[PDB]
Design an enzyme around this catalytic site. Structure first.
Site, PDB file in Angstrom:
ATOM      1  N   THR A  46       0.869  -1.210   0.000  1.00 24.31           N
ATOM      2  CA  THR A  46       0.000   0.000   0.000  1.00 24.31           C
ATOM      3  C   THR A  46       0.894   1.245   0.000  1.00 24.31           C
ATOM      4  O   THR A  46       2.086   1.116   0.346  1.00 24.31           O
ATOM      5  CB  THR A  46      -0.985   0.023   1.180  1.00 24.31           C
ATOM      6  N   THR A  47       0.337   2.397  -0.382  1.00 27.53           N
ATOM      7  CA  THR A  47       1.055   3.699  -0.437  1.00 27.53           C
ATOM      8  C   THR A  47       1.281   4.199   0.998  1.00 27.53           C
ATOM      9  O   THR A  47       0.355   4.072   1.822  1.00 27.53           O
ATOM     10  CB  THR A  47       0.298   4.720  -1.303  1.00 27.53           C
TER      11      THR A  47
END
Ligand SMILES: [Cl-]
Ligand SMILES: [Mg+2]
Ligand SMILES: [Mg+2]
Lengths: 225, 250, 195, 4, 243, 204, 231, 111, 241, 244, 4
Positions: free
Chosen positions: E30-31
């Site tokens: 994920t970012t």
């Protein structure tokens, strides 16, 4: 009695030549001046084995360090290595050393106690005769001593010990370490205590001693044929 | 982490060859030529200072090393492997001998100790053999002058004269013709310089040649006076000037 | 007899020069003020061997600190001293005063008694001869003194300590720690005795 | 040890 | 070939392929972002809501080290947790000996050397995380980003994970449009926006925003999570900017 | 209680003209009780002679230890160890037990095979070397031996004269020590012959 | 393929195959359900027999008075990890007089599983766990994967055909969360959830295993005629 | 020197009936001539209908009771919640006490 | 072909892992240069900050090892920092044990001996870095000693490292062939840095701004790095003659 | 991990042979031939140096014959470096036995220990075996004169006459033909040299290519002498037997 | 041990 004296262009260390076992003189001419490196010598007081052992060990490690670094060894190196060793053993290695020498940094004079404390000085004394020696050094030392003056003062400080201390005796050993010169080791520099001729020769007539048996000892190896 | 390579990296192949020792010897072959000659009154060891760059100061890199006052060493093969062997050789001379007997080991026993270190790198876990052959020249009171070769296997042989590395096969032939049992030290140096010129391509002078002798005692190099029995080291490295002097009478 | 005093421009460390083996003076010109960093110094009291061993290790730790994290605080130096002194309290006889100059924190003094406890103080005294000048120092110490005032306060203080304590004597050594740098002062008997 |  | 089967093996290129493969695990995560403001740092992360059954605000990803350092990472979450556990040991030992809390650059190298150590042997696997961390020390605010190779640098803005390119573009605008600097409260708002914008690369599943910050003025140089009104204010700002 | 005076005994070594002499008593006791009058304290490894006084278990142990070390030396060096070198080996071996020492008073005697120079040396229990020109003493009657040797000895004595001097030095020292006597052996050592003589002496 | 020999090797796409193979052991395992309200947390486990002569393998392990889990995969690995939790729960009590928080119990399992995925010679754990507990912040349900990933949930299921139970809970979320101060109705919802994962076989008296923990309810396991009430 | 032991005084009493047992103790905790607490319990419910008291040095007594309580907990875990009989508890406590044979617990234990 | 994966000999007598470590050295695409003055040793290195998001102050390949010794690295930063920390530790330990500041050439030898071990022991990989150590040694004076992954080291009159080392090497070689001395005959270190920068410009054929360079200077009893402004003053002087 | 690069030096083949032991024996078969012959009144050790040079110092050289103690010697065939490791171990074991029992070690006990060390390297540790075969020539007061051999497997056997290294097949046939039990040392010397002279891969057998040693009761009365022949002595015994 |  061991002393070190700084002078104009180097340092001089001196020692007496007596070793004792209780009140008995074990060795009448004994060497207390130890070569750590060609131009780093140190005088030893305390446990006789310990002073020899600790100088030989550091002397060995200093030689390997000199080869490794491609540099002539420094007194501060010998000093650091001695004090860290003696401190590790919490005084149980009874070595009291005056460490002197010349290196690329200049001329150095240090004392190192058995518990691993070190100090710097222009004149130092260690051993049972230190108080006799220090009395002479405190009376006769000045700044900017010549080589000839420093040897005189050093051997005078040992003599004080030899005469006035029962722990110190026999002859005076000196080592002069001058900057840009080979260290000269003057073994038996003075011989003030030469024994007088005996009144009688105690050489016995041959066959005086009663002999039970006689035999040849074989020291040679197992022989051929 | 942990060194999980507890097994031998050098094993016998079906043919009975130890691959890594053979390959180590191949590395020694690629290496620059070094040689040793034994005279009646001394020993000479010599090699070429193959400078990696002209900006590099070739004096700072020592191919000929003092092990003890009376024992010198030179190599052919991997320089780094040589440097760490010299460090280990100097130490073992102290720990396994001088700290016991109060004197420096004789040539053959120090060689024996170096040989042992190199055999272990041939059998121990998770290591490759040393990629060097050593020539060790030395003197001792009871054996006199001696010259030894030590190979990556740990095998060592005594030599009257020999050469190792690039042009060894040619050099050994040259030495066989010139060597006799009546050679003085100066004669051996002259032969050493002649032999080494054949294996050098470029410049041949005191700055590109590294040469040391095991000869007479050097009291001027001892560093102190006052002990008659200490007469100074028999190992001496020849200066740049001293080599050039003998290249005019060549 | 050792003391460190904070003043307006930084801190000053003072000590005598007498080393004793029993009632014999082994060294009468001892340097009891030791550098652990450029502007972090310490005063050593107790075992000469133990304090040297500690000082030598601290100097090592702060040299390695400097290589990685830059100039350490005086508080950091004091903490490294404490760590050695506290953890080895059973085998050590070391009473150490730590004094240092930051530009942010200015002059700071930390005292470490036998226990290995740490105390940050405006000024600190320690050693055998310190007991005789507790009264004097308390009555005469002010905060934000001048350099000249602080040198006089230390000179007078140690002068009394040396006078009454047999274990204290010789020359008075001082080390001034300010933004200006590091100054070494010496005062000989003929000067400080007639005070 | 020697021992202000 | 076979140079990519074992960790710590150099390819003929001079590359450690096992480390380059670890980066792929990081790219897959994920970012997560970091923004360096006037007197502190802001950390934000994308938390994918796999199922409705996930308890909102409970599965906390951002981790504190000591009391002044924030840590967020993308990739193998357990590997991140392992690295932070070491970070906490390193910060503890430093404070134990030196008394002062570990400076951020000092702390950065502690992680750096540890991660690099996991590229020296075939008996260990490289870290499957890029770690964005920082906080406030005596010398001020510091933001760092640490890769599986052990490589780290200081950053004005940092981003890693699946939406990094999108995030990096939005960070590059802030640097250009604010040379005099950005405030802590502004950086929280901007952090929210950048995560929402970077969520276009994970648009299948809806997500949960999580922000933290260390500011000399707003948190007294301590790491705190953004909660309640201030978090809702940042979500509202972010939602307004995408529309 | 004091380990170095449980079993008792003495060794003395002297130098002469191109010769050395080493001698010892034969007593082994448990303090006052005499047990054995066959306990020789002088051993030889090639042409190097070693006398050992002190705790008898350590005398025996060190003999076995130096036989071990000199045997390996000879195999590797391909020559017999010399007195000067053996002295350094004894010192080394004793000092490696610095904080748990052998309770012994070793004495080395021998002629350097190459230089032909007579050599004697003594040691303390931690391996400090006493390398005297004249004589070395060791054991429970060291005081007595120091007194006898210091008056009787003169330098450059011929082998058959030196024998009488060392013999009278031992015998008269031993008779003034409770824990010494019960017979005595004297080794006369020349470059390439060694004579061993047992002495008649009072057995009390 | 070439990158599945050991746990120390990443694949060219950054995957750990030995971990993924460990994750496969769970899917082979028998189904277990977890769900909670604000007051109580429930485990429901379908136990698996070898044959008709054999007993039904126990799925639920008690960790403390306020915490326990259900297992799916290698039972021996569940024993190792549950024994570790028992010790960590025990250490928290003895040293700090403090009941271990369920969230922290999760963090500890995660860190233990991780070490076995980064070191040569070892292997990942081959089991998935559903940890329920009641602590100072109320009821909790955790899902543990041997990758190290631990997740706090209202409800979930792991093992074979677990997707059926998980879908049901995702619909019922708003209903069962509100079942406060009614343990029997929360179990009913758990039994109705696991029923969505059954095929051919149905819930019998020696087949079904239920556990509950809550506000004034120590972690207790129900087996045999104790669960006949819920069939 | 440092003395690792102390005396906290107090007295305990165990009487066994036909179908019951009592373990009683005073609630006074003392040091030398000082009263530390007038109500500090010394008799504890350990579970499985076992009551325990280790009287003497309070620190060693608290430590032993803790270890036995822990011993009961792990008996349940390792033996399918089996009830620990008093004879079994007694043998378990013997092993706890003898464990520290050469650095004893200065307590008189009644269960 | 596992003789290419670990540090064992190939049939040709080669260590491929060492050769491949040398190739990692150029991965950064940075060129370093070191020269000696009368009283100083100067080391300059290219500085490249490709990302605008990077804090340029934290991007450095020059390290202060001790007060006296400086180290520039050619290779990846992780291995660079590994080598830096070890050299710092070794320099500190040396001072503690032997009571004087570790010389430049002795540290070089020590790091080279460590590098040699990685080429002989299988479980350890070589570091993909070339370490250039600079100081004004109290015995040998201005000193440049360089280490590589093979465990090789030597002293230098001057040296250059990186992709375009040969171009810089020949440029320096040609200068020293004219002057016929082993150093830059210049009093101030300021002018020795100006020389270093000037001869890099001529060799690479590129101009430099203040942010394009990174400078380290060794004088007697301290090694220090120049700020952007200290370099700007240096660049202005070059342009004005 | 590290498993990838492990040769596994201590495993059985499907045929129940030890790969590394078999390959080590193949190595030894290329080494210079060593012969031992045991007579009633002594033992002979003869060994061939491998293709020497004119520039090899022979008088200070030792590759084949080594002294273990005053009563026991070994002839080596294989890696000289490997042999020296084992020889120093054997020399220590002999001195350990002497220290403990105050008696010289019986020959078999020393042989068994060295053979037990070689066995270990074939069953555990994962290291390569020692590429060495020994011929042990010894005397003790139990069995008198004894010949043994050990090989990398750690197996050892006793012999009246034996060969190791190159052309053992050929050498053993010639020994088996000309050996008798009532044989004397002087005869055994002649046999040893005649055997090498016929098996040698060299053009001719010369003094510079041989190491020679005898263990004789030919020592003044009741004792045993070890004689490691000097180059000039080997040259003399080659003329005497009539090979040069 | 012997002991200046
Ligand atoms: Cl090294
Ligand atoms: Mg006074
Ligand atoms: Mg390797």
């Amino acid at each position: 009695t061991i002393v070190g004296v700084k002078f104009n262009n180097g340092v001089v260390i001196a020692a007496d030549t007596r070793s004792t076992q209780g009140p008995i003189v074990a060795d009448k001419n004994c060497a207390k001046l130890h070569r750590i490196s060609p131009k780093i010598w140190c005088a030893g007081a305390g446990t006789a084995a310990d002073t020899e052992a600790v100088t030989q060990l550091i002397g060995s490690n200093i030689e390997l360090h000199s080869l490794y670094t491609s540099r002539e060894p420094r007194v501060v190196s010998a000093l650091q290595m001695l004090k860290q060793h003696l401190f590790k053993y919490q005084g149980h290695i009874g070595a009291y050393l005056i460490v002197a020498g010349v290196d690329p940094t200049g001329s150095h004079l240090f004392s190192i106690h058995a518990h691993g404390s070190t100090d710097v000085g222009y004149y130092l004394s260690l051993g049972s005769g230190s108080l006799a020696a220090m009395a002479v050094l405190e009376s006769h030392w000045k700044q900017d001593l010549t080589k000839e003056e420093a040897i005189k003062l050093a051997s005078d400080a040992i003599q004080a010990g030899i005469w006035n201390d029962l722990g110190s005796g026999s002859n005076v050993d000196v080592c002069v370490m001058e900057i840009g010169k080979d260290a000269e080791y003057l073994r038996n520099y003075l011989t003030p205590n030469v024994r007088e001729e005996k009144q009688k020769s105690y050489k016995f007539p041959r066959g005086t001693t009663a002999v039970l048996k006689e035999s040849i000892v074989n020291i040679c190896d197992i022989q051929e044929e | 982490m942990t060194d999980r390579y507890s097994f031998s990296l050098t094993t016998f192949s079906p043919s009975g060859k130890l691959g890594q020792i053979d390959y180590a010897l191949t590395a020694v072959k690629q290496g620059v030529t070094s040689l040793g000659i034994k005279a009646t009154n001394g020993v000479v060891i010599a090699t070429e200072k193959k400078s990696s760059s002209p900006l590099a100061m070739s004096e700072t890199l020592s191919k000929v090393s003092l092990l003890t006052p009376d024992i010198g060493a030179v190599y052919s093969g991997m320089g780094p492997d040589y440097r760490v062997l010299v460090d280990k050789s100097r130490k073992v001379a102290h720990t396994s001998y001088k700290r016991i007997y109060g004197e420096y080991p004789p040539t053959k026993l120090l060689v024996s100790e170096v040989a042992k270190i190199m055999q272990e790198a041939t059998q121990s876990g998770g290591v490759r053999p040393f990629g060097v052959s050593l020539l060790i020249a030395g003197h001792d009171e009871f054996n006199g002058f001696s010259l030894y070769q030590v190979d990556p296997s740990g095998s060592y042989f005594p030599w009257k004269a020999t050469a190792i590395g690039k042009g060894s096969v040619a050099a050994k032939t040259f030495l066989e013709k010139r060597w006799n049992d009546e050679l003085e030290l100066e004669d051996a140096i002259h032969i050493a310089l002649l032999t080494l010129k054949e294996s050098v391509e470029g410049e041949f002078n005191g700055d590109t040649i590294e040469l040391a002798i095991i000869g007479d005692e050097n009291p001027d190099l001892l560093g102190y006076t006052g002990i008659p029995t200490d007469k100074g080291p028999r190992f001496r490295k020849l200066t740049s000037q001293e080599i050039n002097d003998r290249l005019e009478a060549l | 007899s050792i003391m460190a005093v904070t003043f307006k421009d930084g801190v000053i460390l003072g000590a005598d020069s007498r080393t004793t083996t029993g009632a014999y003076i082994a060294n009468r010109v001892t340097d009891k003020l030791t550098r652990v960093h450029d502007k972090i110094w310490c005063c050593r009291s107790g075992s000469a061997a133990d304090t040297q061993a500690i000082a030598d290790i601290v100097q090592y730790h702060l040299e390695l600190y400097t290589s990685q994290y830059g100039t350490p605080s005086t508080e950091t130096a004091a903490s490294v001293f404490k760590e050695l002194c506290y953890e080895n309290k059973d085998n050590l006889t070391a009473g150490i005063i730590v004094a240092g100059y930051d530009d942010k924190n200015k002059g700071e003094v930390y005292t470490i008694p036998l226990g290995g406890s740490v105390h940050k103080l405006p000024y600190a005294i320690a050693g055998s001869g310190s007991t005789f000048i507790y009264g004097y120092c308390d009555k005469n110490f002010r905060e934000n003194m001048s350099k000249e005032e602080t040198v006089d306060f230390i000179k007078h203080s140690l002068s009394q300590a040396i006078k009454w304590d047999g274990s204290s004597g010789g020359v008075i050594r001082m080390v001034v720690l300010t933004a200006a740098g590091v100054e070494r002062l010496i005062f000989y008997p003929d000067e400080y005795e007639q005070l | 040890x020697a021992y202000x | 070939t076979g140079y990519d089967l074992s960790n710590s093996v150099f390819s003929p290129d001079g590359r450690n392929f096992q480390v380059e493969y670890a980066v792929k695990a990081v790219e897959n995560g994920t970012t997560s972002i970091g923004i360096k403001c006037n007197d502190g740092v802001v950390f934000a992360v994308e938390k994918l809501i796999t199922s409705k059954l996930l308890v909102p605000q409970k599965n906390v990803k951002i981790q504190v080290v000591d009391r002044h350092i924030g840590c967020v990472y993308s990739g193998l979450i357990p590997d991140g947790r392992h690295l932070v556990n070491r970070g906490r040991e390193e910060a503890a030992s430093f404070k134990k000996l030196y008394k002062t809390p570990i400076p951020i650059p000092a702390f950065a190298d502690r992680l750096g050397q540890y991660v690099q150590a996991h590229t020296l042997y075939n008996s260990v696997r490289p870290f499957g995380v890029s770690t964005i961390f920082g906080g406030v020390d005596k010398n001020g605010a510091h933001l760092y980003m640490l890769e599986p190779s052990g490589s780290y640098w200081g950053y004005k803005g940092a981003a890693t994970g699946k939406g990094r390119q999108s995030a990096k573009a939005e960070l590059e605008k802030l640097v250009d449009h604010h040379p005099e600097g950005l405030s802590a409260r502004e950086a929280v708002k901007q952090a929210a926006k950048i995560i929402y914008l970077a969520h276009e690369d994970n648009k299948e599943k809806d997500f949960e925003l999580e922000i933290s910050w260390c500011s000399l003025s707003e948190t007294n140089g301590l790491h705190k999570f953004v909660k309640g009104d201030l978090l809702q204010e940042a979500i509202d700002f972010a939602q307004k900017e995408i529309n | 209680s004091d380990p170095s005076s449980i079993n008792g005994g003495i060794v003395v070594a002297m130098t002469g003209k191109d010769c050395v002499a080493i001698a010892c008593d034969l007593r082994l006791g448990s303090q006052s009780l005499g047990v054995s009058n066959k306990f020789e304290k002088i051993f030889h490894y090639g042409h190097v002679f070693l006398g050992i006084t002190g705790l008898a278990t350590d005398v025996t142990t060190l003999n076995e230890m130096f036989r071990y070390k000199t045997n390996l030396y000879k195999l590797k060096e391909e020559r017999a160890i010399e007195p000067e070198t053996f002295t350094q080996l004894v010192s080394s071996s004793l000092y490696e037990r610095r904080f748990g020492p052998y309770f012994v008073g070793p004495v080395v005697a021998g002629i350097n095979s190459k230089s032909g120079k007579p050599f004697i040396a003594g040691f303390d229990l931690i391996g400090c070397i006493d390398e005297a020109k004249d004589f070395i003493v060791s054991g429970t009657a060291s005081d007595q031996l120091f007194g006898m040797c210091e008056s009787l000895y003169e330098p450059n004595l011929e082998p058959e004269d030196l024998f009488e001097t060392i013999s009278q030095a031992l015998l008269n020292a031993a008779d003034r020590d409770a824990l010494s006597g019960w017979g005595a052996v004297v080794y006369i050592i020349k470059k390439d012959e060694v004579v061993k003589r047992y002495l008649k002496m009072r057995q009390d | 393929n070439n990158y599945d020999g050991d746990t120390v090797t990443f694949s060219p796409t950054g995957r750990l195959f030995q971990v993924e193979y460990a994750l496969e052991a769970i899917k082979q395992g028998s189904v277990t359900v977890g769900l909670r309200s604000n007051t109580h947390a429930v485990l429901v486990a379908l136990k698996r027999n070898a044959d008709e002569l054999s007993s039904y393998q126990k799925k639920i392990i008690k960790c403390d008075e306020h915490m326990g889990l259900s297992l799916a995969g290698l039972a021996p690995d569940a024993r190792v990890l549950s024994n570790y939790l028992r010790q960590q729960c025990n250490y928290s009590s003895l040293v700090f007089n403090r009941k271990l928080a369920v969230e922290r119990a999760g963090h500890l399992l995660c860190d233990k599983a991780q070490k076995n995925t980064q070191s040569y010679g070892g292997r990942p754990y081959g089991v998935g766990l559903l940890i329920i507990g009641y602590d100072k912040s109320g009821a909790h349900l955790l899902e543990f994967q041997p990758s190290g990933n631990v997740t706090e949930l209202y409800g979930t299921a792991i093992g074979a055909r677990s997707q059926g139970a998980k879908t049901y809970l995702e619909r019922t979320l708003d209903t069962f969360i509100k079942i406060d101060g009614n343990p029997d109705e929360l179990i009913k919802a758990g039994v109705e959830a696991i029923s969505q994962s059954l095929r051919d076989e149905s819930l019998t008296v020696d087949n079904l295993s239920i556990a509950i923990v809550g506000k004034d309810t120590p972690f207790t396991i129900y087996d045999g005629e104790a669960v006949a009430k819920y069939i | 020197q440092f003395n690792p032991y102390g005396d906290n005084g107090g007295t305990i009493l165990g009487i066994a009936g036909e179908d019951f047992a009592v373990l009683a103790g005073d609630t006074r905790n003392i040091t030398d001539y000082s009263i530390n607490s007038r109500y500090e319990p010394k008799v504890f419910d350990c579970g499985d209908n076992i009551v325990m008291s280790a009287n003497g040095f309070a620190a060693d007594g608290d430590a032993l009771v803790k270890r036995f309580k822990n011993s009961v907990k792990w008996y349940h875990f390792d033996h399918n919640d089996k009830k620990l009989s008093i004879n079994s508890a007694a043998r378990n406590i013997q092993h706890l006490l003898y464990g520290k044979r050469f650095f004893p617990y200065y307590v008189h234990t009644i269960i | 072909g596992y003789d290419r994966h670990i540090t064992i000999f190939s049939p040709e007598g080669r260590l491929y892992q060492v050769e491949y470590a040398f190739k990692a050295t150029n991965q950064t695409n940075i060129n370093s240069l070191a020269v000696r003055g009368k009283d100083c040793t100067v080391v300059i290195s290219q500085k490249k900050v490709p990302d605008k998001l990077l804090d340029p102050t934290t991007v450095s390949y020059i390290f202060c090892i001790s007060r006296t010794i400086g180290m520039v690295v050619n290779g990846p930063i992780p291995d660079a920092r590994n080598a830096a920390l070890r050299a710092k530790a070794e320099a500190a330990e040396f001072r503690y044990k032997y009571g004087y500041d570790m010389p430049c050439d002795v540290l070089a030898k020590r790091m080279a001996n460590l590098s040699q071990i990685y080429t002989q022991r299988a479980y350890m990989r070589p570091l993909g870095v070339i370490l250039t150590f600079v100081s004004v040694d109290e015995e040998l004076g201005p000193s440049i000693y360089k280490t590589d992954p093979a465990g090789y080291y030597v002293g230098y009159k001057a040296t250059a490292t990186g992709p375009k080392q040969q171009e810089i090497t020949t440029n320096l070689e040609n200068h020293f062939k004219k002057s016929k001395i082993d150093h830059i005959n210049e009093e101030s270190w300021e002018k020795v840095v100006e020389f270093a920068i000037t001869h890099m410009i001529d060799a690479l054929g590129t101009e430099f701004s203040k942010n394009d360079l990174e400078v380290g200077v060794a004088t007697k009893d301290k090694f220090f790095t120049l700020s952007a402004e200290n370099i700007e003053e240096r660049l202005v002087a070059i342009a004005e003659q | 991990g590290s498993r990838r690069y492990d040769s596994r030096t201590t495993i059985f083949s499907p045929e129940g042979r030890l790969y590394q032991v078999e390959y080590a024996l193949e190595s030894i078969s290329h080494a210079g031939t060593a012969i031992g012959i045991m007579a009633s009144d002594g033992i002979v050790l003869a060994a061939e140096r491998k293709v020497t040079s004119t520039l090899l110092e022979q008088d200070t050289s030792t590759e084949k014959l080594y002294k273990l103690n005053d009563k026991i010697a070994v002839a080596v065939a294989g890696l000289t470096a490997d042999a020296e490791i084992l020889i120093n171990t054997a020399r220590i074991h002999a001195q350990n036995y002497l220290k403990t029992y105050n008696e010289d070690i019986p020959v078999e006990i020393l042989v068994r220990r060295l053979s037990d060390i070689k066995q270990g390297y074939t069953q555990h540790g994962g290291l390569r075996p020692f590429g060495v075969s020994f011929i042990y020539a010894g005397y003790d007061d139990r069995y008198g004169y004894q010949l043994y051999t050990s090989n990398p497997s750690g197996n050892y056997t006793g012999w009246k006459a034996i060969s190791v290294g190159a052309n053992t097949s050929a050498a053993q046939t010639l020994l088996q033909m000309d050996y008798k039990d009532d044989m004397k040392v002087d005869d055994a010397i002649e046999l040893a040299l005649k055997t090498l002279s016929k098996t040698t891969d060299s053009s001719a057998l010369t003094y510079d290519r041989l190491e020679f040693a005898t263990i004789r009761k030919g020592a003044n009365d009741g004792e045993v002498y070890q004689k490691i022949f000097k180059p000039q002595e080997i040259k003399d015994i080659l003329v005497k037997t009539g090979i040069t």
